[PDB]
Amino acid sequence: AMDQQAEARAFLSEEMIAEFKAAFDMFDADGGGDISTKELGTVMRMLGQNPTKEELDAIIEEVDEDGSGTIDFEEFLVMMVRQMKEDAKGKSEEELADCFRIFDKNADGFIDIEELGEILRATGEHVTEEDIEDLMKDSDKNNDGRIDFDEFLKMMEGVQ
Numbered sequence: 001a002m003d004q005q006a007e008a009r010a011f012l013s014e015e016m017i018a019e020f021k022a023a024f025d026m027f028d029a030d031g032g033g034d035i036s037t038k039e040l041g042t043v044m045r046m047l048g049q050n051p052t053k054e055e056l057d058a059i060i061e062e063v064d065e066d067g068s069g070t071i072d073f074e075e076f077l078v079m080m081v082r083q084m085k086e087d088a089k090g091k092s093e094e095e096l097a098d099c100f101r102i103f104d105k106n107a108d109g110f111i112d113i114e115e116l117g118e119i120l121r122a123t124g125e126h127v128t129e130e131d132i133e134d135l136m137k138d139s140d141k142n143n144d145g146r147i148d149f150d151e152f153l154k155m156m157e158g159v160q
């Protein structure tokens with residue numbers, strides 16, 4: 001939708017929008033402003049996105065409700081932006097998992113105040129022992145003294 005399309009544009013820098021167009025145009029000989037739904041996956045992949053086939057199929061079904069077999073550049077930017085958000089969140093969850101495992105030194109599944117202090121101290125920041133204990137306090141939601149992955153994610157993400 002026109003709304004959605006205006007928000008996809010807002011999300012991206014103008015040079016990036018022109019870089020996307022440059023690739024996109026390359027599959028539009030017609031200089032119609034649209035490409036074949038059959039090429040959608042290729043241009044997304046080229047632009048470093050990775051939709052699943054199921055995802056590709058969902059999208060095509062969503063833009064090709066008239067049967068013309070094409071996707072226009074405005075609709076393509078809405079798809080691109082949806083895929084980038086899904087992807088960036090995914091990396092972020094993956095990396096978080098990795099910071100957890102590392103924090104959990106003894107790999108018992110929990111961070112304790114000794115492991116929380118060690119990793120915070122190691123930063124070079126001047127954290128005092130009551131500053132580490134406050135962080136613990138605030139993040140430990142079931143008050144068992146440690147930080148489990150669930151509580152880790154809430155502490156890191158924030159809001160979370």
Ligand SMILES: [Ca+2]
Nearest residue numbers: 104106108110
């Ligand atoms: Ca541990």
Ligand SMILES: [Ca+2]
Nearest residue numbers: 140142146147
């Ligand atoms: Ca806890």
